[PDB]
Amino acid sequence: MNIFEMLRIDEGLRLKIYKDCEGYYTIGIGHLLTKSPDLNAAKSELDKAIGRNCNGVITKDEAEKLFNQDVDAAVRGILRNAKLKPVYDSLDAVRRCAAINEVFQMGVTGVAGFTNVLRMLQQKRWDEAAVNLAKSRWYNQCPDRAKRVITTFRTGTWDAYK
Numbered sequence: 001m002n003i004f005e006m007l008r009i010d011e012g013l014r015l016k017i018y019k020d021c022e023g024y025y026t027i028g029i030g031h032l033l034t035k036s037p038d039l040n041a042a043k044s045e046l047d048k049a050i051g052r053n054c055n056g057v058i059t060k061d062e063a064e065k066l067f068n069q070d071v072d073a074a075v076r077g078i079l080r081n082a083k084l085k086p087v088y089d090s091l092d093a094v095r096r097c098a099a100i101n102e103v104f105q106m107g108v109t110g111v112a113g114f115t116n117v118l119r120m121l122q123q124k125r126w127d128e129a130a131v132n133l134a135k136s137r138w139y140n141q142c143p144d145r146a147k148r149v150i151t152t153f154r155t156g157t158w159d160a161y162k
């Protein structure tokens with residue numbers, strides 16, 4: 001088990017655009033296209049992502065290419081954020097996976113707002129952090145996308161994905 005297998009389980013796979021649990025346009029393995037409510041704006045983002053006219057249906061190797069890019073962006077997003085990096089670096093290996101996973105789903109800005117959860121996690125207060133994350137708008141709207149991630153933060157094991 002690793003970050004990629006973890007996210008393949010949580011995000012699964014779609015080969016055509018859908019609205020995710022926050023209502024935004026998406027494809028592949030949790031690849032957010034845009035926050036715009038216009039399908040065609042999402043469609044332009046996709047063609048620009050792949051480098052061809054799709055028109056909205058991608059292959060497996062292309063989905064996996066996007067996935068690699070998005071995992072990388074999520075890690076870079078953490079390391080470049082002043083709120084996220086010190087908390088991230090205090091975390092053990094498995095919880096670092098849940099952190100990458102959270103940012104991958106929610107984006108850096110959304111996650112960076114969790115001021116108390118960030119403090120709780122850095123002070124190693126696993127129980128309280130998991131409770132506070134379970135009150136997030138992220139969790140209440142994307143329950144089974146988020147559930148195993150919150151459990152992972154609490155336990156620090158891979159058992160939720162087992």
Ligand SMILES: CCc1ccccc1
Nearest residue numbers: 078084087088099102
């Ligand atoms: C709040 C989870 C988290 C912690 C550190 C870095 C990213 C995300």
